[PDB]
Amino acid sequence: SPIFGPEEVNSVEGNSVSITCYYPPTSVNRHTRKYWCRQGARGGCITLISSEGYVSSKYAGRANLTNFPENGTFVVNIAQLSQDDSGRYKCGLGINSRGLSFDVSLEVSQGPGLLNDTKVYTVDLGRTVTINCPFKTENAQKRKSLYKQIGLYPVLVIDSSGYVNPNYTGRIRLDIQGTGQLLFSVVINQLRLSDAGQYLCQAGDDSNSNKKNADLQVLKPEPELVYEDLRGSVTFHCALGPEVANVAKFLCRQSSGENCDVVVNTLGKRAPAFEGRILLNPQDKDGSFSVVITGLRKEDAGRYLCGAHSDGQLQEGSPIQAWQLFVNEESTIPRSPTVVKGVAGGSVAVLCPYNRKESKSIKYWCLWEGAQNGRCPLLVDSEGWVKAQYEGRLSLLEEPGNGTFTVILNQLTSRDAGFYWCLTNGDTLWRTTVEIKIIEGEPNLKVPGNVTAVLGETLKVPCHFPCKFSSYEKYWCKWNNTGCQALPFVNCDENSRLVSLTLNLVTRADEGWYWCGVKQGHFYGETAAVYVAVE
Amino acid sequence: LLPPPSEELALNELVTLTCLARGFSPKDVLVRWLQGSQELPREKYLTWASRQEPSQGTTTYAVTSILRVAAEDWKKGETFSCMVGHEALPLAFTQKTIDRLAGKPTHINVSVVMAEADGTCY
Amino acid sequence: LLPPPSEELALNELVTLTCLARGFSPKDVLVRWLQGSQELPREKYLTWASRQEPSQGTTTYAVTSILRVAAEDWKKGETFSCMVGHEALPLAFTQKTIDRLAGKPTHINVSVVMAEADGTCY
Amino acid sequence: ERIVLVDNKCKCARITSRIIRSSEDPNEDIVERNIRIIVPLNNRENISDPTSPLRTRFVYHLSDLCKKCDPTEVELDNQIVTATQSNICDEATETCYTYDRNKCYTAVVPLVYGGETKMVETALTPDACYPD
Numbered sequence: 001s002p003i004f005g006p007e008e009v010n011s012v013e014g015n016s017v018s019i020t021c022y023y024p025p026t027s028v029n030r031h032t033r034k035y036w037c038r039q040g041a042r043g044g045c046i047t048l049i050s051s052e053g054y055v056s057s058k059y060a061g062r063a064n065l066t067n068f069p070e071n072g073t074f075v076v077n078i079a080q081l082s083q084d085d086s087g088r089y090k091c092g093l094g095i096n097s098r099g100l101s102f103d104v105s106l107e108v109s110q111g112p113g114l115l116n117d118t119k120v121y122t123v124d125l126g127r128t129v130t131i132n133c134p135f136k137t138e139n140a141q142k143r144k145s146l147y148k149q150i151g152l153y154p155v156l157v158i159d160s161s162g163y164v165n166p167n168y169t170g171r172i173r174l175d176i177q178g179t180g181q182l183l184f185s186v187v188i189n190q191l192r193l194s195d196a197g198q199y200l201c202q203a204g205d206d207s208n209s210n211k212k213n214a215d216l217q218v219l220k221p222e223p224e225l226v227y228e229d230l231r232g233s234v235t236f237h238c239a240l241g242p243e244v245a246n247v248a249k250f251l252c253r254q255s256s257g258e259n260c261d262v263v264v265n266t267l268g269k270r271a272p273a274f275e276g277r278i279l280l281n282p283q284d285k286d287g288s289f290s291v292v293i294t295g296l297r298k299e300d301a302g303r304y305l306c307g308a309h310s311d312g313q314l315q316e317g318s319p320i321q322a323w324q325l326f327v328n329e330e331s332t333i334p335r336s337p338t339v340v341k342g343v344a345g346g347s348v349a350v351l352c353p354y355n356r357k358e359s360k361s362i363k364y365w366c367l368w369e370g371a372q373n374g375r376c377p378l379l380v381d382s383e384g385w386v387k388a389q390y391e392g393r394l395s396l397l398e399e400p401g402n403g404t405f406t407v408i409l410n411q412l413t414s415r416d417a418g419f420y421w422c423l424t425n426g427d428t429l430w431r432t433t434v435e436i437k438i439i440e441g442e443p444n445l446k447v448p449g450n451v452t453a454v455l456g457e458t459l460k461v462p463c464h465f466p467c468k469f470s471s472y473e474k475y476w477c478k479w480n481n482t483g484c485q486a487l488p489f490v491n492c493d494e495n496s497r498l499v500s501l502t503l504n505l506v507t508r509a510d511e512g513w514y515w516c517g518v519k520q521g522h523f524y525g526e527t528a529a530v531y532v533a534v535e
Numbered sequence: 536l537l538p539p540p541s542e543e544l545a546l547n548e549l550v551t552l553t554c555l556a557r558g559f560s561p562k563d564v565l566v567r568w569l570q571g572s573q574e575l576p577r578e579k580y581l582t583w584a585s586r587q588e589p590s591q592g593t594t595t596y597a598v599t600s601i602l603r604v605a606a607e608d609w610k611k612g613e614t615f616s617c618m619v620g621h622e623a624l625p626l627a628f629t630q631k632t633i634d635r636l637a638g639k640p641t642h643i644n645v646s647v648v649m650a651e652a653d654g655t656c657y
Numbered sequence: 658l659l660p661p662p663s664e665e666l667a668l669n670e671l672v673t674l675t676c677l678a679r680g681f682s683p684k685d686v687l688v689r690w691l692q693g694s695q696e697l698p699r700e701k702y703l704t705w706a707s708r709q710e711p712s713q714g715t716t717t718y719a720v721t722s723i724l725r726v727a728a729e730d731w732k733k734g735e736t737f738s739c740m741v742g743h744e745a746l747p748l749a750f751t752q753k754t755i756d757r758l759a760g761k762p763t764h765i766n767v768s769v770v771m772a773e774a775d776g777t778c779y
Numbered sequence: 780e781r782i783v784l785v786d787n788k789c790k791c792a793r794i795t796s797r798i799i800r801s802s803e804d805p806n807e808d809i810v811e812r813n814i815r816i817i818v819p820l821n822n823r824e825n826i827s828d829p830t831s832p833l834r835t836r837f838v839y840h841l842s843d844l845c846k847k848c849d850p851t852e853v854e855l856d857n858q859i860v861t862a863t864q865s866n867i868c869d870e871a872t873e874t875c876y877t878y879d880r881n882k883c884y885t886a887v888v889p890l891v892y893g894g895e896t897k898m899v900e901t902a903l904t905p906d907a908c909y910p911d
């Protein structure tokens with residue numbers, strides 16, 4: 001079940017193949033036994049090549065099996081294929097009679113031998129092609145006809161003078177650079193699946209049933225495999241050519257009953273179930289762009305398609321790109337609160353998990369706009385910068401460390417609800433989203449209004465707390481760009497009330513924002529805020 | 536009349552039963568227990584008072600009681616009963632009875648998979 | 658660790674226990690035996706040398722050893738166990754164990770008891 | 780076979796269940812409960828080496844399979860309280876029947892090195908005791 005790879009693989013004889021399988025990188029899985037095996041009929045699942053030094057007799061000289069532990073993958077090569085090699089197969093780990101496997105289907109076909117009467121043209125659907133047929137000048141004034149064969153009958157439905165087939169509508173144009181020589185061609189844009197096969201082509205006709213053979217093959221693209229897990233993020237890379245660099249471009253998901261279903265467009269559409277956890281970047285000079293989807297759930301598994309078409313949907317005659325995604329779900333990404341609540345005037349605090357092996361990174365805090373396509377304006381970084389309009393009410397803190405940092409956002413209002421993102425600078429990027437809701441109530445800690453200052457004498461400011469906070473520590477701090485640091489002239493007078501602080505001199509040097517806080521040593525808690533003046 | 540919880544069965548101590556009556560219009564009621572045909576003395580069991588319910592217009596009342604017996608008596612096959620007296624009943628009494636074999640399931644499939652045939656999936 | 662052959666058990670003088678290690682890449686090993694939990698001295702058994710086995714891919718090696726113990730203690734129910742030390746193992750030693758019941762038993766007795774299958778599982 | 784109620788690894792038992800509802804006669808449906816036991820035929824009673832013979836009696840109580848004790852969070856009025864979810868898991872003392880694939884098991888054996896004896900440590904499941 002947590003094992004994944006290519007479901008279908010194809011090649012022709014004499015060639016090589018290179019299969020890759022995936023497993024969760026836990027320590028038991030890196031050291032256990034890997035196998036490739038042939039699921040035959042009558043029960044058994046006989047091993048062909050293994051990780052513990054075993055190579056079979058039929059695979060002698062042709063194969064090996066290398067294991068990459070930091071990837072979490074292992075690769076299998078089979079050279080010099082055949083037609084006894086067609087069948088179903090399995091990757092795996094451990095013992096074969098359990099089920100830590102994944103099925104793979106291998107199909108291999110016969111090549112052409114001593115039949116070189118062919119002229120091929122390779123194309124992926126959405127591009128241009130030529131089908132060249134011999135232009136004879138001994139039929140100088142004769143039609144350059146090209147039939148189509150359904151069965152054995154060359155059906156008279158395409159002429160070369162302005163008559164085209166009722167199914168090949170609007171897209172057949174041809175060029176004149178011979179006209180005295182053998183040179184004409186037919187150029188087709190937007191190749192379909194139904195535009196395949198050999199066609200009865202010729203240029204000019206002596207009446208004695210003369211023939212010619214020349215085919216095309218158009219191919220469907222092969223999906224890049226992406227391996228993700230629960231509560232993580234993914235990134236696609238649509239990289240179509242500059243021929244469609246100014247068409248509307250889309251991204252959907254193939255479903256069961258022949259129904260692609262839109263996830264984003266560039267004409268402004270979105271699913272209901274992807275609100276707050278998706279992006280779409282502005283493209284570069286050559287026409288490639290990024291798509292991010294974070295917080296991955298169980299039902300995001302399946303084939304995805306990106307393309308370009310003039311109305312923003314999947315229609316035939318448009319160039320595509322593919323991916324196939326797997327969600328591991330035996331993940332080691334820690335769980336987190338998805339929604340955090342607060343009241344008008346209160347604070348919040350978020351736990352933001354990253355990877356322990358990337359602890360020398362740089363941390364960021366977004367706010368998902370959702371207006372154009374999706375955008376992160378950055379609000380605060382780990383290096384000492386904050387936004388302008390969030391002054392006095394935001395800071396990022398490195399404690400507790402070792403898997404997790406925290407961020408404090410107070411002085412709430414009912415328009416502060418939304419979806420928020422956090423992101424590190426390392427190589428592997430989990431992006432974690434939390435929703436801030438606003439419900440009504442009363443703030444726990446209690447401070448006065450906006451406290452002025454006298455010129456030439458002292459100030460004192462109180463700050464209460466209720467009685468469940470009687471075992472938690474109390475502190476004060478002064479806020480600047482790097483965060484806020486605790487002060488030593490607080491007293492914490494009462495046993496269950498009135499943490500205060502005075503300022504020994506009214507000069508302008510500390511005319512800033514102040515907080516009043518609560519913490520259980522490492523983990524932080526609620527706070528409030530007042531701004532000081534000097535008159 | 537409710538059966539015991541399955542947590543108490545797998546410990547071999549006393550097990551517990553619950554009687555419950557609800558929906559009666561004056562708040563006067565009597566509750567007695569039986570074992571087979573013998574009425575137990577009324578200092579073996581606890582009975583709460585009679586209180587009224589949240590409702591829709593018409594007002595009604597409810598009452599519970601419990602009785603704790605030994606697990607060997609339950610697993611023998613001895614039955615127990617809860618009797619309720621009230622004045623809106625025509626014969627002034629109702630009974631319910633419980634033992635094992637009361638909420639037994641009606642379909643059981645047992646398949647034994649031998650050696651040489653393991654096919655476990657993850 | 659292989660059990661004794663069936664023919665040696667009838668004669669009732671001594672039995673023999675075979676310890677085979679197979680498929681390891683450097684050719685240095687260590688074999689020691691235990692009875693109960695107490696290590697036997699070196700002169701009770703016989704260990705051959707490490708040699709290279711026919712090729713199926715990578716080149717690997719093998720070794721054997723035998724120990725002869727009294728046929729009364731095999732039926733009293735003592736246990737004997739074999740230990741192998743090699744460079745590639747995780748904690749440099751591993752062991753396997755055998756006695757009269759495990760290993761050619763002529764008897765498989767198993768009892769499975771599933772207690773309260775209809776039992777409000779939470 | 781749709782919703783997993785328990786997947787226990789000390790006893791190696793798995794229990795799923797599923798409601799499959801008929802539309803005609805809405806007073807009666809059927810509720811299915813599937814149990815899978817895998818019996819190890821070669822494990823000892825205590826898991827060390829010389830303990831005792833083969834375990835030959837295997838006992839499963841449904842109230843101890845389905846037991847859930849790691850704490851949870853409940854929101855009562857506007858509060859987050861931590862609750863336990865079971866009466867019976869006082870701390871182990873449980874006898875396990877199988878090994879667990881992600882935990883590793885060691886033993887301690889005395890051997891001699893010419894002079895005195897040491898306290899050599901020995902792996903019992905070698906795939907899982909790799910120090911990294």
Ligand SMILES: *[C@@H]1O[C@H](CO)[C@@H](O[C@@H]2O[C@H](CO)[C@@H](O[C@@H]3O[C@H](CO)[C@@H](O)[C@H](O)[C@@H]3O)[C@H](O)[C@H]2NC(C)=O)[C@H](O)[C@H]1NC(C)=O
Pocket residue numbers: 825826827
């Ligand atoms: C199942 O078998 C194991 C293996 O014998 C038992 O674990 C160990 O049992 C011994 C015997 O009492 C305990 O011995 C102690 O060893 C320490 C050294 O670590 C020594 O300093 C003490 O003086 C004492 O002799 C040991 O605590 C214990 N646990 C270990 C090694 O982790 C186990 O108790 C057996 N279980 C049952 C239910 O029989």
Ligand SMILES: *[C@@H]1O[C@H](CO)[C@@H](O[C@@H]2O[C@H](CO)[C@@H](O)[C@H](O)[C@H]2NC(C)=O)[C@H](O)[C@H]1NC(C)=O
Pocket residue numbers: 068070071073
């Ligand atoms: C992770 O797997 C990839 C699979 O493509 C490895 O990439 C190539 O590996 C071969 C060795 O078999 C090298 O010769 C190539 O240079 C690798 N890179 C590319 C771009 O082809 C990669 O080596 C694996 N990771 C590690 C750390 O080895």
Ligand SMILES: *[C@@H]1O[C@H](CO)[C@@H](O)[C@H](O)[C@H]1NC(C)=O
Pocket residue numbers: 061062063064065066077078079
């Ligand atoms: C053996 O493995 C190497 C990589 O380790 C690979 O490049 C090579 O193709 C393999 N040999 C075969 C398939 O004959």
